[PDB]
Coordinates of C-alpha atoms and ligand atoms in Angstrom, one line a residue:
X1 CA -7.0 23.2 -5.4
X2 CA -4.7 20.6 -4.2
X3 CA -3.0 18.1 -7.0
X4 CA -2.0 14.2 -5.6
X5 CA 0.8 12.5 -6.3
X6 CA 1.3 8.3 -5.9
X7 CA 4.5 6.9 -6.1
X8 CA 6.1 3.7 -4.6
X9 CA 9.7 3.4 -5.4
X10 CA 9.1 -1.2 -4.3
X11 CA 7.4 -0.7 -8.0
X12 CA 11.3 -1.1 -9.5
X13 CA 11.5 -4.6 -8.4
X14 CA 9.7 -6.1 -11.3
X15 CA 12.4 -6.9 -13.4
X16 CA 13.6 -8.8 -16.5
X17 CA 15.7 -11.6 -15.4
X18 CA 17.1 -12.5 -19.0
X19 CA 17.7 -8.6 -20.3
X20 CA 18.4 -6.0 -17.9
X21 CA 18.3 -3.6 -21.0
X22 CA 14.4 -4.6 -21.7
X23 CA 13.1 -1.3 -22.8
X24 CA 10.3 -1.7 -19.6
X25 CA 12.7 -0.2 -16.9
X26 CA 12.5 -0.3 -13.0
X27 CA 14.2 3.3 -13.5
X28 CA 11.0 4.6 -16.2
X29 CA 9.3 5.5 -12.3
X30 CA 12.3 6.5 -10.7
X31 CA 13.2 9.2 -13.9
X32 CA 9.9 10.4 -13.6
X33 CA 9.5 11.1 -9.7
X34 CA 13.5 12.4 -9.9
X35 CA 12.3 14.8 -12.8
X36 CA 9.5 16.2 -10.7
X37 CA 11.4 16.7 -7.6
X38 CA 14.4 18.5 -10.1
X39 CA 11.4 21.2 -11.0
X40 CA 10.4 21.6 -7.8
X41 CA 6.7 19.5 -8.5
X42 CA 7.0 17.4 -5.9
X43 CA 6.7 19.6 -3.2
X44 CA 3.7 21.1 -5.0
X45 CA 1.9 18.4 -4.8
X46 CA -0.4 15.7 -1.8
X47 CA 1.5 12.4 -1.4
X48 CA -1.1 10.6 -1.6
X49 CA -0.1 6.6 0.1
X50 CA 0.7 3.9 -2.4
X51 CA -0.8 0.5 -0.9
X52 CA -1.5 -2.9 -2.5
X53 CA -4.6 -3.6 -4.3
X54 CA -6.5 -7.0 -3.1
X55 CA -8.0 -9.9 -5.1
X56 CA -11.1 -8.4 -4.8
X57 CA -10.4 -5.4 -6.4
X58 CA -8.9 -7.9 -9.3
X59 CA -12.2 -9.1 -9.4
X60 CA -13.9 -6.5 -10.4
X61 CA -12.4 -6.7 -14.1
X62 CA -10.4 -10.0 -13.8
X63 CA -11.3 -13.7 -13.7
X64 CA -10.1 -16.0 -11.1
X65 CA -8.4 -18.0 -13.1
X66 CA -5.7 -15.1 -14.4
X67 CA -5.7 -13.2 -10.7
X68 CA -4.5 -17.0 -9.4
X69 CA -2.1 -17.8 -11.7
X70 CA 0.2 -14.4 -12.1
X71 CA -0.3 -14.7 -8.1
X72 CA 1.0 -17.7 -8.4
X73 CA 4.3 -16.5 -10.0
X74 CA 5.3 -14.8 -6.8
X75 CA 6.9 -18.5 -5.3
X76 CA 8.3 -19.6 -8.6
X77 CA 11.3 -20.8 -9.7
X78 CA 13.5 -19.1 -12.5
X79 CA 12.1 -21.7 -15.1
X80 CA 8.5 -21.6 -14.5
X81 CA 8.9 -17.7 -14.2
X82 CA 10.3 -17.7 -17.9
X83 CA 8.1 -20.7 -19.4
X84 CA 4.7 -18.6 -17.8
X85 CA 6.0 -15.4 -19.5
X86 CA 6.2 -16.7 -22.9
X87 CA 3.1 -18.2 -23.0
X88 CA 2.0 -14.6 -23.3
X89 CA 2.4 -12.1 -26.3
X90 CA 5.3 -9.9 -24.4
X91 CA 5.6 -10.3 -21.0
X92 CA 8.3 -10.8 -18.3
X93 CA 8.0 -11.9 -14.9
X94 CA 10.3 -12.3 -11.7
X95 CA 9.3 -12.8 -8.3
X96 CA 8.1 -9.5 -7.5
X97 CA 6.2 -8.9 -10.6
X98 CA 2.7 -9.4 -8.7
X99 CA 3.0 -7.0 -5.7
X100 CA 4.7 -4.4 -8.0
X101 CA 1.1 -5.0 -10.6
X102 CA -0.8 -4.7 -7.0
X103 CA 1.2 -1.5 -5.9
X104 CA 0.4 0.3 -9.2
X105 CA -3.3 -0.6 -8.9
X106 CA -3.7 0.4 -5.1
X107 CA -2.2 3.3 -6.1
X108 CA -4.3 4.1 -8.3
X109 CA -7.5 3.3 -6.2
X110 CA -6.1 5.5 -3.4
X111 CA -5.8 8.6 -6.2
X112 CA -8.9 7.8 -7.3
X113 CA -10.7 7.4 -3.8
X114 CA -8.5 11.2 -2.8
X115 CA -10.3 12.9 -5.7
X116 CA -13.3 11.4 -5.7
X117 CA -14.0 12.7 -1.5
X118 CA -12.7 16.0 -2.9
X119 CA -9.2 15.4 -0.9
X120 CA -7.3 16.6 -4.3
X121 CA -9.2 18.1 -7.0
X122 CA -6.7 15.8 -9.6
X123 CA -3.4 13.4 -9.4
X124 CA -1.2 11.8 -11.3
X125 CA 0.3 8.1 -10.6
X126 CA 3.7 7.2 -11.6
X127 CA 3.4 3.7 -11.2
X128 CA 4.9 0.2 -13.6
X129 CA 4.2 -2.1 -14.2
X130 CA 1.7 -0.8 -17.5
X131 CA -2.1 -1.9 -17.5
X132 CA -4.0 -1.3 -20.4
X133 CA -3.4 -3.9 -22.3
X134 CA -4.1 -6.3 -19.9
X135 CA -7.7 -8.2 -20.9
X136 CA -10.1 -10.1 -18.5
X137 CA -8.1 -13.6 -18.9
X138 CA -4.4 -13.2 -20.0
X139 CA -1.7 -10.8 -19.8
X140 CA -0.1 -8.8 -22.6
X141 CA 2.2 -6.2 -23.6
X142 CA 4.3 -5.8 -20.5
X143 CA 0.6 -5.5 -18.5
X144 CA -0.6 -8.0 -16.3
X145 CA -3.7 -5.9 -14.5
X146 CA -5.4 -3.6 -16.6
X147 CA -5.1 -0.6 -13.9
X148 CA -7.0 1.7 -15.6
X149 CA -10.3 -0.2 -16.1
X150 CA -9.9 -1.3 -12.2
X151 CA -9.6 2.1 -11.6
X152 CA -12.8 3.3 -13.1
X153 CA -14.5 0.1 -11.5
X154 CA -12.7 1.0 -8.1
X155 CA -14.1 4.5 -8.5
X156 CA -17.7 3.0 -9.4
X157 CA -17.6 0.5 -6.1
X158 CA -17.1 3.5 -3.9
X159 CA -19.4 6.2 -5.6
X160 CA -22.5 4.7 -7.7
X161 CA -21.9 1.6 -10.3
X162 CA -23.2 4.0 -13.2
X163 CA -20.8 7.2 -12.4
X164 CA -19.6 8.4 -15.6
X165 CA -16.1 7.9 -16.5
X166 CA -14.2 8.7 -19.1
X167 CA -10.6 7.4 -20.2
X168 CA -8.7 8.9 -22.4
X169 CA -5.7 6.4 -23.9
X170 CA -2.9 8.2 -25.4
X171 CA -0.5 5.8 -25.1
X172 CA 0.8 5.0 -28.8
X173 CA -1.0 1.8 -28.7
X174 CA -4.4 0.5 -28.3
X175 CA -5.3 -0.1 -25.2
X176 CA -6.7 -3.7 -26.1
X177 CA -7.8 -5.0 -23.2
X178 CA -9.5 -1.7 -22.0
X179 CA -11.5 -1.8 -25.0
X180 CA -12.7 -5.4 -24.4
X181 CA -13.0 -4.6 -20.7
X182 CA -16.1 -1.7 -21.8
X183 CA -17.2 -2.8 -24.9
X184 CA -20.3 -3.3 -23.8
X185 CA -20.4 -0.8 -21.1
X186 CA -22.1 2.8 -21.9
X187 CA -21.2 3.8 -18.1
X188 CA -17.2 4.1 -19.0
X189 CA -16.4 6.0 -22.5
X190 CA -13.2 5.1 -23.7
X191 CA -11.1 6.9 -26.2
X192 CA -8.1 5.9 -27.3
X193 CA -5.3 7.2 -30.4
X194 CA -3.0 4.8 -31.4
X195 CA -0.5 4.2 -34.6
X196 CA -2.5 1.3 -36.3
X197 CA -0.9 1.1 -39.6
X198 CA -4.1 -1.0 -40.6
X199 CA -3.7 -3.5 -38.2
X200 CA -0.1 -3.8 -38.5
X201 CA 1.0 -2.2 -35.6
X202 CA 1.3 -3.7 -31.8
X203 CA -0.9 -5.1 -30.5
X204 CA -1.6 -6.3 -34.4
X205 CA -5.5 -6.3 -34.5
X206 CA -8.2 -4.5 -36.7
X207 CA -10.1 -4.2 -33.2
X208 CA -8.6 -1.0 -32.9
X209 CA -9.6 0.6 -35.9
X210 CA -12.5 3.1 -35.9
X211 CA -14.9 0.9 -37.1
X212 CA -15.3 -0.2 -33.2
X213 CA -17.9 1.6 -31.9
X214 CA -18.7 -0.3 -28.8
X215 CA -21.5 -3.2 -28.7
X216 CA -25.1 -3.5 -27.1
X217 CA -25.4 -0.4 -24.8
X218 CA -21.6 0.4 -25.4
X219 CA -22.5 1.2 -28.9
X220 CA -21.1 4.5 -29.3
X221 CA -18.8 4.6 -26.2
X222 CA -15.9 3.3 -27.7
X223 CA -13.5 5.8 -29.9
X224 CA -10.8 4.8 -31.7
X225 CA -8.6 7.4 -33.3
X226 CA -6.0 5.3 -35.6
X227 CA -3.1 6.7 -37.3
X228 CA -1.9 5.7 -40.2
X229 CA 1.1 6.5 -42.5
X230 CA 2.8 9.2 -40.8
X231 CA 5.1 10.6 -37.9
X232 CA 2.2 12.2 -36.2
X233 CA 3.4 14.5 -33.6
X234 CA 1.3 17.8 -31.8
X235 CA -0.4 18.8 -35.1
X236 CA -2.2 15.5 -35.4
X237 CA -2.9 14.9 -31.5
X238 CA -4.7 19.3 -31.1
X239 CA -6.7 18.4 -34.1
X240 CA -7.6 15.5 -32.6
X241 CA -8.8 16.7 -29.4
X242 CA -10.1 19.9 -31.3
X243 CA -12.7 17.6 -33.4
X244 CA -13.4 14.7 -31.3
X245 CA -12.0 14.2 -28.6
X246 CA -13.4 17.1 -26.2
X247 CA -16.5 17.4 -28.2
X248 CA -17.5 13.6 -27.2
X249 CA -15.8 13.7 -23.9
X250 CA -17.9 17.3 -23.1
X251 CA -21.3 15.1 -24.2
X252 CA -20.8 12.6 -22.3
X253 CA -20.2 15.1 -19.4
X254 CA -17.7 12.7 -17.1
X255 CA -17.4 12.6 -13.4
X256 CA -13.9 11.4 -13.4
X257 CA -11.1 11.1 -15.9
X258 CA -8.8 8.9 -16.3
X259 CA -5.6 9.4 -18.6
X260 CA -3.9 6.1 -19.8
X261 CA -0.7 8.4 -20.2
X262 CA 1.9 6.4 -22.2
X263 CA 4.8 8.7 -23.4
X264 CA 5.6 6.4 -26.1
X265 CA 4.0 9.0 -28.5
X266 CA 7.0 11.1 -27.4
X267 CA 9.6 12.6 -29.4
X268 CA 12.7 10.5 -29.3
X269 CA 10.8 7.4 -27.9
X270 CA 12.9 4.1 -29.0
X271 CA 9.4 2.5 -30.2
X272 CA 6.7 4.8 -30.8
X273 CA 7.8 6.5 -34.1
X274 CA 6.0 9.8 -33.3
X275 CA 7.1 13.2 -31.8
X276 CA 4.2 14.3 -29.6
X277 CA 6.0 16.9 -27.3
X278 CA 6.1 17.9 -23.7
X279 CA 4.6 20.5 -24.1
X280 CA 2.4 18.8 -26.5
X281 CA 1.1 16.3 -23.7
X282 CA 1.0 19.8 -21.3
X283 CA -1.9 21.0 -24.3
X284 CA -3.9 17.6 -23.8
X285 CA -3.7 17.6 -20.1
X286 CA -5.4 21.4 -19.5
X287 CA -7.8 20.5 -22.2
X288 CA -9.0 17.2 -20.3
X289 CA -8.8 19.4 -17.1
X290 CA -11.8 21.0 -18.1
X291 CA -13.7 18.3 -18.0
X292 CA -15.4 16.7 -15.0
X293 CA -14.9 19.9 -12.7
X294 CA -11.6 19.4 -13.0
X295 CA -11.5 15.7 -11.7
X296 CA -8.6 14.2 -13.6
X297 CA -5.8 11.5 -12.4
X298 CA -2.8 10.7 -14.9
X299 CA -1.7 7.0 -15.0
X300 CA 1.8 6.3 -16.0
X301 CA 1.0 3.3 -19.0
X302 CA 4.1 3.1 -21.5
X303 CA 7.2 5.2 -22.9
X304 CA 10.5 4.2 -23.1
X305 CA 12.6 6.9 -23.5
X306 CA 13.6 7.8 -19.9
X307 CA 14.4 11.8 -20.6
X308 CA 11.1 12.5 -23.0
X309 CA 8.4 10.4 -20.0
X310 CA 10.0 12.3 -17.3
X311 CA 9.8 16.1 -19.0
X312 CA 6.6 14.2 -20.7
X313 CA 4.8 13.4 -17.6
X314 CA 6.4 16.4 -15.6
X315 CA 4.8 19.1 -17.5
X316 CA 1.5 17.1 -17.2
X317 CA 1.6 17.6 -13.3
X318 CA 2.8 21.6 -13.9
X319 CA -0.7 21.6 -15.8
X320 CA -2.6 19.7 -12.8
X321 CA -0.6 22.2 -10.5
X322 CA -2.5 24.8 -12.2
X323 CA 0.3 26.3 -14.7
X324 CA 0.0 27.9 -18.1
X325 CA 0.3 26.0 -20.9
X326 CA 3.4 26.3 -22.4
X327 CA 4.0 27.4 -26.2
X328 CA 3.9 24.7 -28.9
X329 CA 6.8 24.6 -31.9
X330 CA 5.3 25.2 -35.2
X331 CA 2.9 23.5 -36.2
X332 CA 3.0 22.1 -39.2
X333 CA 0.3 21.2 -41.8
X334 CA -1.7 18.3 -40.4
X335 CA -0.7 15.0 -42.8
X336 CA -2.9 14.2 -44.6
X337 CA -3.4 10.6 -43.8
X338 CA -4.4 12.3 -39.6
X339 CA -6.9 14.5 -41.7
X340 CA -8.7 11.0 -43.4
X341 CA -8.6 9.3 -39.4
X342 CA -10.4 12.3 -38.2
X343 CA -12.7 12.3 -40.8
X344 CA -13.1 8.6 -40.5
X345 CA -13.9 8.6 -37.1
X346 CA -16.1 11.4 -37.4
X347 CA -18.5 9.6 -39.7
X348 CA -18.6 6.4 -37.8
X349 CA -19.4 8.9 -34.3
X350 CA -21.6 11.3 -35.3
X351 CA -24.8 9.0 -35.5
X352 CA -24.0 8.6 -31.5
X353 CA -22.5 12.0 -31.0
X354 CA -24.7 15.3 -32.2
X355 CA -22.0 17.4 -31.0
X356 CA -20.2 16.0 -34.2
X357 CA -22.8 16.7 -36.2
Ligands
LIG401 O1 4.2 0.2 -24.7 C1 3.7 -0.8 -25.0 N1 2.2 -0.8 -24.9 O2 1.5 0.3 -24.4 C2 4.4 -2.0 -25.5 C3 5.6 -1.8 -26.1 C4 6.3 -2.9 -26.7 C5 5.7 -4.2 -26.7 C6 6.5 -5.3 -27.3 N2 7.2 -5.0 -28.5 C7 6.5 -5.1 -29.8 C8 6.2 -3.7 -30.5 C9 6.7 -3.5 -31.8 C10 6.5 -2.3 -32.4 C11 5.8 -1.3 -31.7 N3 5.4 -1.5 -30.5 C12 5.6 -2.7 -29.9 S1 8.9 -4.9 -28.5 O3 9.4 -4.5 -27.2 O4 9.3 -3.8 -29.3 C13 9.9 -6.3 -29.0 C14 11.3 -6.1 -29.6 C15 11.8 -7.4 -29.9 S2 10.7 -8.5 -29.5 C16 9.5 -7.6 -28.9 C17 4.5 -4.3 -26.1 C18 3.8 -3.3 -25.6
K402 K1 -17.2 1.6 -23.6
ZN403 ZN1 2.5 1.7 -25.4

């Protein structure tokens, strides 16, 4: 039982030209991969080769039009760099913001491709820049390829188109443009939890409430778990999992998992607001690892504080590696507002789900 590992330290170059401080660090990778090699992880684990993802591969969930224009951004000048950016909602280029959005999704491709001819049985990619809420057309949110739903396309090219995947999004936001990507896919089950704070929290749209079941043969294959009012930490996230998450994910019986793994849940994360733990994150990783015989690979999405992604994403790989889970802190009480999402979502899934039943 071998565990991969994908990391390319050419994925720092993508920088901020106006705030070096802009909480989407070059160093969020580097932390990570430094943590791992501090606990002895590295080692541990396959390198598996970063490489660069081609146009084609953009293709399969991007139109030409957005594939040619961030391309495009490679040759630009300082000026049309920042004018391009802000006609997005959050995003900042330089020069080498395309190879490094390449890098992480050839990476990605490569993990996928290891597990899928039972090379690794699992893998985790530390890769920037983020993906997920990258949509079809535009960029967004510090994302300007949605790596995640290429991944699961990737992993369809090279097995059969209708191979079952399932993604799991616990970065604190919704992953938008994953969402939109599968809407109306069945073949591609995507769960995400998210602080929604009814629509008032980024990315700002009722489309991630859990109301959105999916559409025509998607209906059902698209879970939102939406948090509202509350620091939800490891309470919230196990009863989660416990009532909907692994019951849908074990229906749908997956042949690969993804993990859109932003840390931004974390305790001590500058933006999140929550305090999902390392050893938190460690509980959700073996849980999904019993899935899909075991066929799991980690992407690095969000999280901004540099100490809680690296011991965050660090303890996901000890759990890949095959360790036990760690103990949780007390738990406390689930709040009350998690226990109404739950229930929510419960009653919109179980017409599609009889495991919820
Ligand atoms: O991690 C991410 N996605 O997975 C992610 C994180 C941040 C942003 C942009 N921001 C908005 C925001 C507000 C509240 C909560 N979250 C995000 S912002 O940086 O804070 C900002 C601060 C002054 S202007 C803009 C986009 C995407
Ligand atoms: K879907
Ligand atoms: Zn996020």
């Amino acid at each position: 039982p071998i565990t991969g590992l994908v990391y390319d330290q050419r994925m720092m170059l993508h920088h901020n030209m106006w705030d070096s401080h802009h909480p989407e660090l070059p160093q969020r990778i580097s932390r990570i991969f430094s943590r791992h090699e501090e606990l002895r992880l590295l080692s541990r684990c396959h390198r598996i080769p970063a490489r660069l993802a081609t146009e084609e591969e953009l293709a399969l969930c991007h139109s030409s039009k957005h594939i040619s224009i961030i391309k495009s951004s490679e040759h630009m000048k300082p000026r049309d760099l920042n004018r391009l950016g802000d006609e997005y909602n959050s995003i900042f280029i330089s020069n080498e913001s395309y190879t490094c959005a390449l890098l992480a999704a050839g990476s990605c491709f490569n993990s996928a491709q290891a597990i899928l001819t039972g090379q690794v049985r699992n893998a985790v990619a530390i890769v920037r820049p983020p993906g997920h809420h990258a949509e079809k057309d535009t960029a967004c949110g510090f994302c300007f390829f949605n790596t995640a739903a290429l991944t699961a396309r990737y992993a369809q090219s090279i097995t059969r188109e209708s191979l079952r995947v399932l993604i799991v999004d616990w970065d604190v936001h919704h992953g938008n443009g994953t969402q939109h990507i599968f809407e109306e896919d069945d073949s591609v089950l995507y769960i995400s939890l998210h602080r929604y704070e009814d629509g008032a929290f980024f990315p700002n749209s009722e489309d991630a409430n859990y109301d959105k079941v999916g559409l025509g043969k998607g209906r059902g294959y698209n879970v939102n778990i939406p948090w509202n009012g509350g620091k939800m930490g490891d309470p919230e996230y196990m009863a989660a999992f416990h009532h909907l998450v692994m019951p849908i994910a074990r229906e749908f019986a997956p042949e690969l998992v993804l993990v859109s793994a932003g840390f931004d849940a974390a305790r001590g994360d500058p933006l999140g607001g929550f305090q999902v733990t390392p050893e938190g994150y460690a509980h959700l990783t073996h849980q999904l690892m019993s899935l899909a015989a075991g066929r799991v690979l980690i992407i690095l999405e969000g999280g901004y504080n540099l100490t809680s992604i690296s011991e965050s994403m660090s303890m996901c790989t000890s759990m890949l590696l095959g360790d036990s889970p760690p103990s949780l802190d007390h738990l406390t009480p689930l709040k009350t507002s998690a226990t109404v999402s739950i229930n929510n979502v419960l009653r919109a899934h179980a017409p599609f789900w009889s495991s919820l039943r």
